Amino acid sequence: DEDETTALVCDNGSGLVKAGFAGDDAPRAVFPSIVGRPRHQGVMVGMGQKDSYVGDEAQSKRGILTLKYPIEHGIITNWDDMEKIWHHTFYNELRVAPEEHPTLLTEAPLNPKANREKMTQIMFETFNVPAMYVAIQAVLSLYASGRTTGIVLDSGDGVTHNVPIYEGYALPHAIMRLDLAGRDLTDYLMKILTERGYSFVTTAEREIVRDIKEKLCYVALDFENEMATAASSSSLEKSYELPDGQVITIGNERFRCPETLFQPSFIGMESAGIHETTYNSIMKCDIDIRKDLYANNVMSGGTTMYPGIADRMQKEITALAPSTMKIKIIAPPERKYSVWIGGSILASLSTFQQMWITKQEYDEAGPSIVHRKCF
Amino acid sequence: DEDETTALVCDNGSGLVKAGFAGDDAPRAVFPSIVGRPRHQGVMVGMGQKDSYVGDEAQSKRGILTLKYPIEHGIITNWDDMEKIWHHTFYNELRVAPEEHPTLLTEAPLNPKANREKMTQIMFETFNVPAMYVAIQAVLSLYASGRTTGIVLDSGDGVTHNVPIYEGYALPHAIMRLDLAGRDLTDYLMKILTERGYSFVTTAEREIVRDIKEKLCYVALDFENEMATAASSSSLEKSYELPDGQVITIGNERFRCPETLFQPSFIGMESAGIHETTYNSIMKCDIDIRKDLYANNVMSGGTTMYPGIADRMQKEITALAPSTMKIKIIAPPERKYSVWIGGSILASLSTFQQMWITKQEYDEAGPSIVHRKCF
Amino acid sequence: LMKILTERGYSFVTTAEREIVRDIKEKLCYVALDFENEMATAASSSSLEKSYELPDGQVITIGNERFRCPETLFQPSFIGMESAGIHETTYNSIMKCDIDIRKDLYANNVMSGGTTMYPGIADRMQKEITALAPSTMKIKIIAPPERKYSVWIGGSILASLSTFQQMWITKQEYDEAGPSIVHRKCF
Amino acid sequence: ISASRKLQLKTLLLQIAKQELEREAEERRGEKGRALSTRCQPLELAGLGFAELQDLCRQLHARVDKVDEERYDIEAKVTKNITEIADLTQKIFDLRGKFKRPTLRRVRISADAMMQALLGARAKES
Amino acid sequence: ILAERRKVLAIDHLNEDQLREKAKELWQSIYNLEAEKFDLQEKFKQQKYEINVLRNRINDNQ
Amino acid sequence: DDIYKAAVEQLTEEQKNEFKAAFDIFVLGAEDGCISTKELGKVMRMLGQNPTPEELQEMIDEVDEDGSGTVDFDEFLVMMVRCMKDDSKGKSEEELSDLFRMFDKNADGYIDLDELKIMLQATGETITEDDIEELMKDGDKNNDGRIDYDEFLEFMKGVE
């Protein structure tokens, strides 16, 4: 349907998959990384009804489905379900056949090896894609943001990777990776709202809480002052409409959940928080690197859309940083949608045509080729 | 008499049996679930007179018969009288021989198991039916109404089932079966008419009270306001002709009897009424189910024909339901018969021809097989 | 149990009936460490049914339903609940704790409250957790006779500890602060 | 438009569409048999010695294997498209359907023996 | 499954003319395989066509 | 109703005079002499069956050539050629796809007015753009200006 064998770009995370073609500005479609399955016995006959549902089908029919995510903390653990998600992504909504297009997939630099290897195998064996590449999330964010140097703090649904990059090169000894993510904030919000009389323990309830989080929650610039008021007055509560007509209001819980990014102890995690790890990613780099990383804190990934987060991340690191020097945050309206955007940019670069793995080299090496050719 | 080798449909309640063939929109005939027997000493020789009367015969000669109903509170106990009613139903009025036709029977899912086992056994062993299938009255009601989703209140003669179905799936944990039905409303009316001076105790008299209810009663949208005037003036009274030329005039009793549907305590039952059962069947389902069940409350069977019932039920549930949400009732003119129609629809669907117990599987397993094969 | 006994021909829908079923459950039910083989036989033979005397002198016998009810704790789908059941939930609570904690919790699963009095429950839970648990390790259940009464017994113990005499809210602190004080003084 | 006019119109439309599916198919099939006789060419066996005709049997089975592979790929695709045919087929049999299953109306019963036994000697209508 | 069409091979004990024979039946199986393939192509162009049809309906009748 | 009136045409008309005499009989119980809804009930108990005020009134609609709110004599011919289930081959996804391949000559999925005019001109029978376009509409319930296959089914539903 395209006038060129443009690469397909699929930003497959632990949240939603954003997909479209290289050279465009935006994904053609977005899909929950979900395969749904009925938890009930059918009663009426000739009702259609699938054994399993994919993406938005799984979410739309969720009233009686248990919903599973094949990707956890950035890694595919269930590749049969990812084959279904990709079939849907490519043939039902993008309506393209990867057999005629190179495909670009994304991951964090320390994502366990099985992820990129199984992603490579699925696209070469079930879709028979002519070429593959698995790209770095930080690289993709840097292209989207217009930078070659900076800290990419990618606090999304799966993991926070936090990798410093200078002149387009990794500074791997300074990756302050953290097992704290948007999915934990969602789990925390389900629990804290349960305490308000609105229990959220089932799949339908979990999807509702994620929707509540995305629309009602924030981190603010000053937690203690924000809570001093939110805990004292109803003036800071915000309502939300649930699908069945219930109305829930959230007070200080509205920010106490999200605050776990700065205070991980709220969910039992042992961590300094995302702002200290951002600071250390800069500090652990050489002294002649530090000045450029301080001036370029690059925000990407999920959770970047919480009110007060860009302002707060710059405040928290500038407060740890030395005086005289200027410390700055980069947090464009392209935040979180930067990995997909970077995929489009990267896939299309003329210099990247030497990075793509072809369905030639693949057959001689097998999917393990991804560890020889990508990064 | 019939031009096709189609399935037979018979909906057998504690009141009447609705029977005809699959593919029609009405039973060929309705046979009361009655076997009648003379209760007096005979005096004339050579003037015929039967030892027993079946179905319509039992009502036609009822002046000297005691009339017994084989089915109680949704199930068959007098299997012998059921076989006689069926023999008459099939061979004399439907003009069919079940040996040459598969047969569909019905029950409520929260009725005792013996019912489906004995109905299956009679058709396979005394009628030699080539196949059997015991259906869910709620399923049949949803097919007849053009729905896959809703709460079905089937208004039986015996019991009311109250079941939520979503996307063709049962949600059994939310079934609220209630021990309140047309025969209880009839008993209440016999007692209330006694208060007015008209004693109805014998079979002929009991049949009349049922007939009075069917022609004079209603529920009313607002019971208290309706009683305020019904209890104060003759302007809300109606006279019923008793079959001897005398009349009975009934006032607020006209609605106080059907009111038991909203107030079961009138007959000694511990229940908040049919709108509570409807509500809890929705409320006990997940919130992503509830929106579709609120919008699809389904009236089926008798009592659904009472003035004020569709409007009263929608008012009574919306009063318990959250605001914003739309509560709606489905109440087609195919009243008191739509479940039969659903029987016809299911029996004739291509999607259902694999659901039959054959007279092979039955002979090998025995009647307990119905529990594995039907639902 | 009220619903499955209804299927057997003994409907239970009212308050008196609910109390009867609770009494039946408490006296006749068990879970079984092996419910699959237990139901293969219990659902096939009257020899495994136990008679219960109803308040009016009528008798109900219960077969595989006897354990089918308790089984819900391991098979929550029986009541429409989206859950892995109590053995997996216990396992996940162990799993969610730090790796140097997990081993002490695997060795110390403690029964309290009610339903922990069903025959086969200590063994059912220990075996299900053992199946989910890693090898080498010993998984164990503590199931004291102070079952169901253990929260009360603990209350007696706690109220009386010398290290807990400073944990009490006085009827002074209460009035100065109001009932919201419970959030500052108790936990 | 007249009654029998539209009658012959629609019936000849549908029969024409039938026979013309069949005509495209018979040209398809001419294409088939011709291309079969080409890519599976009328054989040439003799002249080749024992060893040479051994290689010849081996390679004709190798061509068995090639057309094996070809038709196998095509049938895998045909399986996927049968899948998709049925998928969107029921999907739309719902979209334009969910009731595209017609009914059997109660007025639609046989009346032949009725007319006959009723009119007796004058049994005429049906 | 390709191998139940990549049948094992026997050529040596086949006399020159018996080679002619088995090669002939192999070519007959080839012709059958070409028939299968081409009918799959016609069925398959029908498949692709009527699935374009399907999605046309999908859009016009969503 | 041109199908029933074609049957009228395609069959002999002495059966129609027979139904005229039967309609003269259908003044019995007819306060109108005709076959209205109630009169269809009484004519059918005179005919042997008994449709419903919806079924009687819908047969009326199903015989409402003129929309006369009754089953007139001509409408009674329609009735006698109207009260059964016979239109065969149920051409649907499978069979109307076999057809649509040519209806939609395009090998695409839409009988446009050109596809339809071509198919009709191929029928051999006389063709009008009144025919082609009325059949387009019978298709074009989605109104694509071109009969989609769902339009094709709303068009050729059961028709053979």
Side-chain angles (χ1 to χ4, degrees):
Chain A
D1 297 339
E2 301 296 341
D3 58 334
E4 181 57 291
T5 58
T6 180
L8 302 174
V9 179
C10 297
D11 184 23
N12 293 280
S14 66
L16 273 67
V17 179
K18 298 200 296 297
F21 65 92
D24 204 355
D25 295 299
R28 294 286 294 168
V30 301
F31 309 88
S33 295
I34 299 175
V35 177
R37 294 180 173 88
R39 69 184 182 88
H40 288 268
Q41 172 66 55
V43 76
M44 300 186 74
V45 59
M47 298 292 104
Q49 305 302 313
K50 296 177 178 174
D51 57 317
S52 61
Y53 295 80
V54 60
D56 52 304
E57 293 178 338
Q59 188 181 56
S60 292
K61 298 292 185 179
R62 68 187 180 273
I64 58 169
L65 306 178
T66 187
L67 302 182
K68 304 294 184 182
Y69 288 80
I71 299 169
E72 297 184 353
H73 301 291
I75 181 162
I76 298 167
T77 63
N78 184 330
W79 39 84
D80 292 342
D81 286 347
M82 289 305 300
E83 182 180 359
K84 288 181 177 294
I85 292 167
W86 290 350
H87 179 80
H88 180 70
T89 297
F90 293 126
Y91 292 96
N92 295 338
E93 295 299 317
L94 271 55
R95 300 186 188 175
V96 298
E99 186 171 2
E100 295 182 349
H101 301 276
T103 299
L104 187 150
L105 304 176
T106 66
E107 68 176 13
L110 294 170
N111 191 304
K113 285 177 174 170
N115 190 59
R116 68 178 81 167
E117 186 170 343
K118 295 301 287 182
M119 287 191 293
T120 299
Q121 186 173 38
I122 293 166
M123 290 306 300
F124 281 114
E125 299 200 3
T126 64
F127 295 97
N128 306 135
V129 71
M132 290 293 289
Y133 189 83
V134 178
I136 296 168
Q137 289 171 327
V139 168
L140 296 169
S141 294
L142 287 170
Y143 282 113
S145 294
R147 295 291 185 275
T148 62
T149 301
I151 304 299
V152 180
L153 190 290
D154 54 358
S155 295
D157 192 84
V159 300
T160 300
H161 194 68
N162 193 26
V163 53
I165 298 172
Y166 183 90
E167 292 284 318
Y169 301 72
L171 303 172
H173 65 283
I175 297 167
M176 298 296 105
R177 190 170 160 101
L178 174 65
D179 291 340
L180 180 64
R183 187 175 292 189
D184 295 300
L185 298 178
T186 300
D187 188 71
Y188 189 11
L189 187 62
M190 288 189 281
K191 289 180 171 66
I192 206 167
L193 297 178
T194 298
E195 292 178 359
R196 281 176 71 85
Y198 297 80
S199 177
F200 297 95
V201 299
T202 69
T203 294
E205 290 170 349
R206 183 170 62 251
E207 288 293 304
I208 292 167
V209 171
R210 181 171 65 82
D211 194 66
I212 291 168
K213 182 188 73 171
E214 290 175 6
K215 293 183 176 75
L216 275 70
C217 291
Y218 65 97
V219 297
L221 186 59
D222 183 326
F223 175 75
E224 292 76 10
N225 288 339
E226 190 70 21
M227 188 173 178
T229 300
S232 298
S233 177
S234 66
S235 68
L236 298 181
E237 291 190 349
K238 177 73 178 177
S239 65
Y240 176 89
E241 180 183 347
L242 279 81
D244 60 346
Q246 290 180 70
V247 178
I248 186 167
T249 64
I250 305 174
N252 63 26
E253 303 86 357
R254 190 173 170 202
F255 56 92
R256 287 165 67 197
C257 267
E259 181 65 12
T260 301
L261 291 172
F262 296 93
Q263 301 186 59
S265 67
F266 289 181
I267 60 169
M269 179 64 190
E270 182 185 352
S271 175
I274 64 170
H275 59 292
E276 185 166 351
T277 57
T278 298
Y279 176 75
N280 286 335
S281 292
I282 296 167
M283 184 185 77
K284 297 292 186 181
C285 296
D286 289 353
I287 194 165
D288 286 321
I289 295 172
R290 292 194 196 146
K291 74 185 200 296
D292 296 292
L293 296 176
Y294 277 119
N296 296 281
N297 182 17
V298 179
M299 178 175 271
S300 186
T303 77
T304 61
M305 299 298 174
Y306 282 121
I309 195 67
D311 292 344
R312 176 133 185 218
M313 287 296 285
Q314 185 178 292
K315 180 179 174 182
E316 291 292 352
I317 66 170
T318 198
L320 297 174
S323 66
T324 301
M325 179 170 278
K326 298 178 185 69
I327 301 98
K328 297 182 178 180
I329 190 164
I330 300 168
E334 282 87 7
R335 63 167 160 265
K336 106 191 201 212
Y337 322 97
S338 68
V339 173
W340 186 89
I341 292 165
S344 181
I345 293 167
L346 178 58
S348 299
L349 297 174
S350 65
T351 58
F352 185 67
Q353 303 308 307
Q354 301 301 309
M355 295 302 294
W356 284 103
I357 299 168
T358 64
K359 184 172 68 172
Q360 294 171 311
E361 293 169 305
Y362 179 84
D363 288 298
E364 292 179 351
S368 68
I369 192 165
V370 72
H371 302 295
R372 294 179 179 86
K373 298 291 187 176
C374 291
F375 63 91
Chain B
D1 292 300
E2 298 291 357
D3 57 339
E4 182 60 294
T5 58
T6 186
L8 305 176
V9 178
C10 302
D11 186 21
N12 298 275
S14 67
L16 301 99
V17 179
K18 298 186 289 295
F21 66 89
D24 206 332
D25 62 335
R28 289 290 307 277
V30 179
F31 304 84
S33 295
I34 301 172
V35 178
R37 294 180 173 88
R39 71 185 186 88
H40 297 92
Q41 174 67 55
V43 296
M44 303 187 75
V45 177
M47 307 278 104
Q49 304 305 314
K50 297 175 179 171
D51 54 290
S52 63
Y53 296 79
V54 178
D56 52 304
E57 291 178 339
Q59 289 178 323
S60 293
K61 259 72 179 177
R62 68 187 180 273
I64 58 169
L65 307 177
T66 180
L67 302 183
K68 304 296 184 183
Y69 291 84
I71 298 167
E72 296 183 354
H73 298 292
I75 64 170
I76 183 68
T77 62
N78 189 336
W79 76 268
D80 186 65
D81 286 348
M82 174 176 266
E83 188 273 333
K84 288 188 284 294
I85 292 167
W86 285 351
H87 189 80
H88 174 66
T89 296
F90 290 123
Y91 289 90
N92 293 332
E93 292 295 332
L94 270 57
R95 301 288 179 86
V96 298
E99 184 178 3
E100 297 181 2
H101 304 277
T103 300
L104 184 149
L105 304 176
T106 67
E107 68 175 16
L110 294 181
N111 287 142
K113 286 166 68 173
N115 185 60
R116 63 170 74 185
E117 291 175 351
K118 295 301 290 183
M119 289 191 296
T120 299
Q121 182 172 45
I122 293 167
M123 291 305 297
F124 282 115
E125 297 182 29
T126 66
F127 292 90
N128 297 313
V129 71
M132 292 294 290
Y133 187 85
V134 179
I136 298 168
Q137 289 173 313
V139 168
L140 298 182
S141 295
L142 289 171
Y143 280 115
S145 293
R147 295 291 185 274
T148 62
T149 300
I151 307 299
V152 180
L153 285 87
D154 55 0
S155 296
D157 300 299
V159 298
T160 300
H161 184 67
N162 300 302
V163 57
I165 299 171
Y166 179 82
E167 293 283 318
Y169 288 80
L171 303 172
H173 64 284
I175 298 167
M176 301 292 148
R177 183 174 65 75
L178 176 65
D179 287 337
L180 175 61
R183 293 282 291 277
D184 296 300
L185 296 177
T186 300
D187 190 71
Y188 186 74
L189 184 61
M190 289 189 280
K191 289 180 173 64
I192 206 166
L193 296 178
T194 299
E195 290 179 350
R196 284 177 75 86
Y198 292 75
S199 172
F200 296 91
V201 297
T202 67
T203 294
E205 292 172 336
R206 292 194 296 272
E207 291 291 295
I208 292 167
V209 172
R210 175 183 55 75
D211 196 71
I212 292 168
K213 183 176 76 70
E214 292 173 357
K215 292 184 175 72
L216 274 66
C217 289
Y218 65 99
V219 296
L221 182 58
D222 181 327
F223 176 80
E224 292 76 10
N225 287 339
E226 191 71 18
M227 188 174 181
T229 61
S232 298
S233 178
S234 66
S235 66
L236 279 82
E237 291 183 335
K238 182 169 169 68
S239 298
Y240 174 90
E241 180 180 348
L242 300 169
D244 65 0
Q246 297 185 99
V247 299
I248 183 167
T249 300
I250 301 169
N252 64 25
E253 301 85 4
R254 190 173 174 198
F255 50 98
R256 286 161 65 197
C257 294
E259 181 65 12
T260 301
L261 292 172
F262 296 95
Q263 296 182 64
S265 67
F266 287 7
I267 60 167
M269 179 64 197
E270 184 188 354
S271 175
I274 62 169
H275 57 293
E276 181 69 24
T277 61
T278 301
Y279 180 74
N280 288 335
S281 291
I282 297 167
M283 184 185 77
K284 297 294 187 181
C285 297
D286 289 349
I287 67 290
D288 285 321
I289 296 171
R290 289 181 181 181
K291 74 185 199 297
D292 296 293
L293 295 175
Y294 276 119
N296 296 280
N297 288 313
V298 178
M299 299 294 104
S300 179
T303 79
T304 62
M305 292 177 72
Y306 285 129
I309 194 66
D311 295 298
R312 170 129 193 217
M313 285 292 285
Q314 188 172 289
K315 182 176 182 291
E316 290 291 358
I317 283 76
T318 195
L320 299 175
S323 69
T324 302
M325 178 58 69
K326 173 66 178 177
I327 294 86
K328 182 176 178 180
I329 294 175
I330 299 168
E334 304 209 320
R335 299 259 236 311
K336 139 191 235 179
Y337 292 91
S338 67
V339 70
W340 184 87
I341 293 168
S344 179
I345 293 167
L346 178 58
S348 63
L349 297 178
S350 66
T351 66
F352 178 71
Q353 300 306 310
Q354 301 302 310
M355 293 297 291
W356 291 110
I357 300 166
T358 66
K359 188 179 187 298
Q360 181 65 49
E361 290 173 313
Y362 176 85
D363 287 347
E364 292 173 3
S368 67
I369 193 167
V370 70
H371 189 67
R372 293 192 300 275
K373 294 289 186 176
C374 294
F375 63 92
Chain C
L1 186 59
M2 291 171 74
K3 289 180 172 65
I4 65 174
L5 295 179
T6 298
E7 289 185 350
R8 288 173 66 84
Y10 296 80
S11 175
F12 296 91
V13 298
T14 69
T15 294
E17 290 171 346
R18 183 170 65 195
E19 292 297 304
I20 293 166
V21 173
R22 180 173 66 83
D23 189 60
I24 291 168
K25 182 184 80 191
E26 290 176 6
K27 292 179 168 66
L28 275 71
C29 291
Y30 64 97
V31 71
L33 70 88
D34 180 346
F35 74 92
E36 184 175 0
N37 285 302
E38 188 69 15
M39 73 184 178
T41 301
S44 297
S45 175
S46 67
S47 66
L48 275 69
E49 292 182 344
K50 178 70 176 178
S51 296
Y52 175 88
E53 296 179 359
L54 298 170
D56 60 354
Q58 294 186 86
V59 176
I60 184 168
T61 64
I62 303 174
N64 55 305
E65 299 89 354
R66 226 163 115 209
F67 57 96
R68 276 309 291 275
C69 166
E71 182 176 330
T72 301
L73 293 173
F74 297 85
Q75 297 287 268
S77 67
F78 286 0
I79 59 169
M81 178 66 201
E82 186 189 356
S83 176
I86 64 169
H87 58 292
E88 187 167 356
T89 301
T90 299
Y91 175 79
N92 285 334
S93 292
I94 295 168
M95 180 186 74
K96 289 177 180 291
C97 297
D98 286 349
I99 194 165
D100 285 316
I101 295 172
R102 288 188 196 157
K103 71 183 179 70
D104 296 331
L105 297 174
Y106 277 113
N108 295 278
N109 290 307
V110 180
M111 292 185 161
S112 189
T115 76
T116 52
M117 292 177 72
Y118 287 127
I121 196 66
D123 294 298
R124 181 62 185 279
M125 286 294 287
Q126 187 174 290
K127 289 178 182 292
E128 288 288 357
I129 294 168
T130 299
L132 296 171
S135 66
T136 300
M137 180 174 278
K138 297 180 185 70
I139 294 86
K140 296 184 178 182
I141 295 176
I142 296 95
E146 292 81 16
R147 35 204 204 179
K148 105 214 249 181
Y149 300 86
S150 63
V151 173
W152 187 89
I153 294 294
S156 180
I157 293 167
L158 179 59
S160 299
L161 297 175
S162 65
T163 60
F164 182 68
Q165 299 304 306
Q166 301 302 310
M167 293 300 293
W168 287 100
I169 299 167
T170 65
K171 191 174 192 299
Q172 183 61 39
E173 289 172 310
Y174 175 80
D175 291 293
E176 292 175 1
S180 68
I181 193 167
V182 72
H183 298 294
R184 279 98 76 187
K185 293 289 295 197
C186 295
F187 58 90
Chain D
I1 310 158
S2 156
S4 168
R5 270 285 306 109
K6 270 163 297 195
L7 261 291
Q8 311 151 213
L9 281 171
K10 281 202 174 194
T11 180
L12 294 184
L13 269 174
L14 305 161
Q15 275 72 244
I16 278 301
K18 282 140 218 170
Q19 59 78 33
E20 180 39 49
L21 163 80
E22 322 317 324
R23 197 278 304 155
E24 80 171 3
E26 55 83 11
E27 296 187 353
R28 283 171 144 194
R29 184 44 202 65
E31 298 164 355
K32 167 165 141 182
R34 296 186 285 268
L36 318 191
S37 65
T38 67
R39 69 198 198 266
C40 168
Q41 69 296 335
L43 282 186
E44 310 75 7
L45 287 304
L48 275 200
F50 275 70
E52 304 168 315
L53 257 164
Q54 284 147 25
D55 320 301
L56 199 158
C57 266
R58 194 276 320 156
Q59 57 79 25
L60 266 174
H61 178 66
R63 177 56 177 166
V64 177
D65 308 337
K66 311 154 197 154
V67 192
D68 154 66
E69 216 81 16
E70 303 145 19
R71 72 89 154 168
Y72 201 53
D73 309 332
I74 311 301
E75 64 78 29
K77 304 146 198 166
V78 162
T79 301
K80 302 144 199 156
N81 259 354
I82 287 163
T83 303
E84 185 182 16
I85 274 179
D87 298 347
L88 319 183
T89 289
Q90 196 36 65
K91 162 195 196 312
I92 298 149
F93 204 57
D94 302 331
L95 277 196
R96 59 159 153 76
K98 295 144 190 153
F99 189 55
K100 191 152 271 286
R101 280 77 66 195
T103 79
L104 306 194
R105 187 152 136 102
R106 190 235 53 91
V107 312
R108 312 196 280 181
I109 320 298
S110 178
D112 304 306
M114 309 314 105
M115 304 314 302
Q116 302 318 274
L118 270 40
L119 297 168
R122 304 165 300 104
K124 63 186 74 65
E125 200 277 319
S126 301
Chain E
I1 298 183
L2 301 148
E4 52 84 17
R5 300 167 297 272
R6 275 90 52 85
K7 280 84 64 171
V8 290
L9 278 194
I11 57 185
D12 264 348
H13 67 307
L14 268 63
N15 183 297
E16 208 176 356
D17 54 11
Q18 175 44 29
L19 289 156
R20 304 173 170 102
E21 170 276 334
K22 173 217 172 205
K24 177 64 179 179
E25 59 83 15
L26 285 168
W27 173 90
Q28 196 37 62
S29 49
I30 294 157
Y31 190 86
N32 314 142
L33 283 148
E34 317 273 18
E36 306 145 23
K37 171 180 38 177
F38 211 108
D39 298 322
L40 289 156
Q41 301 154 3
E42 318 319 287
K43 151 69 171 161
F44 194 60
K45 298 166 314 180
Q46 219 67 26
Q47 278 167 289
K48 296 168 297 198
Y49 158 62
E50 273 295 326
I51 294 170
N52 316 326
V53 169
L54 286 165
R55 61 193 35 93
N56 299 319
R57 303 141 43 172
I58 284 161
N59 321 324
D60 278 287
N61 306 278
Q62 201 42 61
Chain F
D1 210 311
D2 270 315
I3 65 153
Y4 309 108
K5 306 324 289 170
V8 171
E9 297 151 0
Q10 291 133 2
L11 298 180
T12 43
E13 284 62 23
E14 302 74 359
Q15 188 190 7
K16 283 73 185 176
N17 193 8
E18 167 261 327
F19 290 140
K20 188 271 291 178
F23 212 97
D24 300 331
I25 307 167
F26 295 156
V27 192
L28 170 148
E31 295 70 14
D32 66 353
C34 187
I35 305 180
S36 316
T37 315
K38 193 279 297 175
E39 262 79 8
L40 183 49
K42 69 92 184 177
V43 156
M44 273 292 174
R45 58 89 191 158
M46 213 183 324
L47 275 167
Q49 214 195 35
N50 285 116
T52 82
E54 204 294 320
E55 289 200 303
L56 314 158
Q57 181 41 56
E58 215 52 39
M59 291 147 84
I60 286 189
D61 307 349
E62 296 142 27
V63 308
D64 270 332
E65 329 163 9
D66 48 357
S68 48
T70 173
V71 190
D72 292 307
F73 160 69
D74 52 85
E75 309 181 302
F76 170 58
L77 318 166
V78 175
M79 159 161 307
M80 298 278 96
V81 309
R82 188 205 36 73
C83 306
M84 207 46 253
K85 308 163 287 192
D86 313 280
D87 188 6
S88 78
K89 206 158 72 61
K91 54 191 72 178
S92 86
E93 292 137 332
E94 317 83 11
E95 180 49 42
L96 281 184
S97 290
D98 305 326
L99 302 199
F100 200 61
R101 177 53 209 99
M102 299 316 169
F103 268 86
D104 174 76
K105 269 312 173 310
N106 322 317
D108 302 342
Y110 285 92
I111 318 155
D112 205 311
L113 205 58
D114 315 323
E115 293 73 329
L116 196 41
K117 72 175 282 308
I118 285 158
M119 277 286 311
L120 278 167
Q121 294 163 355
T123 63
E125 205 214 3
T126 177
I127 304 314
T128 80
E129 193 38 73
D130 188 6
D131 306 326
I132 309 146
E133 188 34 64
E134 73 165 0
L135 300 199
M136 173 65 38
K137 311 143 190 149
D138 307 352
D140 274 353
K141 320 305 205 322
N142 316 327
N143 303 270
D144 315 343
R146 44 170 201 165
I147 295 185
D148 202 347
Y149 188 49
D150 289 0
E151 279 166 333
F152 187 30
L153 283 146
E154 314 168 283
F155 158 51
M156 280 306 193
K157 198 151 193 176
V159 192
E160 187 186 4

